[PDB]
Design a protein around this ligand. Sequence first.
Ligand SMILES: COC(=O)c1[nH]cc(-c2ccccc2F)c1N
Lengths: 125, 126
Amino acid sequence: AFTVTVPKDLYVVEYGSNMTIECKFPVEKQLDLAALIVYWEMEDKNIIQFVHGEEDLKTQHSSYRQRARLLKDQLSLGNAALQITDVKLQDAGVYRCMISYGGADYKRITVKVNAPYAAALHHHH
Amino acid sequence: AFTVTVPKDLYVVEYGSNMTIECKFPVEKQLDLAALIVYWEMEDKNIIQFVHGEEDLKTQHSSYRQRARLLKDQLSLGNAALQITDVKLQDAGVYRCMISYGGADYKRITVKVNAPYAAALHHHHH
Ligand SMILES: COC(=O)c1[nH]cc(-c2ccccc2F)c1N
């Protein structure tokens, strides 16, 4: 059946770095943007919506303002990679990659963030 | 755009009663089953998969065995209504209705279960 696959279900990233979370889906012949829907969310916070060939962020949660983008170029290859710049402790948690493309599926990915003491302390208070 | 809507985002149900949680989506003319995907889950446990015109429960979690049903008649009206019979305290939580039909969207629905002391006790020490 139509299945979304994630090569890695767990990422361990360092505070302050960039991360790309990979998410795959079958592309039969040439990609039909009008039928492609991608949601990226993390525990109910919308990160990215991709509808009609364009990024929509009118409902993007505020913690990801200016830091999230979907790599448009790889969609035609079946790669819905989400790139998060300068990762923060608040970015740790469970992400969901939800794809609709003649069929619909989603997968979960856990992100862990390591951070030095100073950053962790600032986040603690 | 194609949008899923819920008439009620919160249900309060009594232990041991039946529950039907509604989930709406636009149907232009007549519903085309070959294009329809309906997916009902509750905090990561699959309740119902309805893929291009037929129910799949080969991935249905055990907690919903024999108790969950998708009302085929209301799908044809654009309502993906989920009925859970004899609701238990474990059924409380966040449900997600995910629909793909020339477009895709989902909504969350919260269920609270009021229970008498005895059922709550049995659940507390199981
Ligand atoms: C098995 O049915 C499913 O898994 C499913 N149904 C609908 C979706 C969906 C919902 C909003 C955006 C994108 C989507 F793909 C989905 N993942």
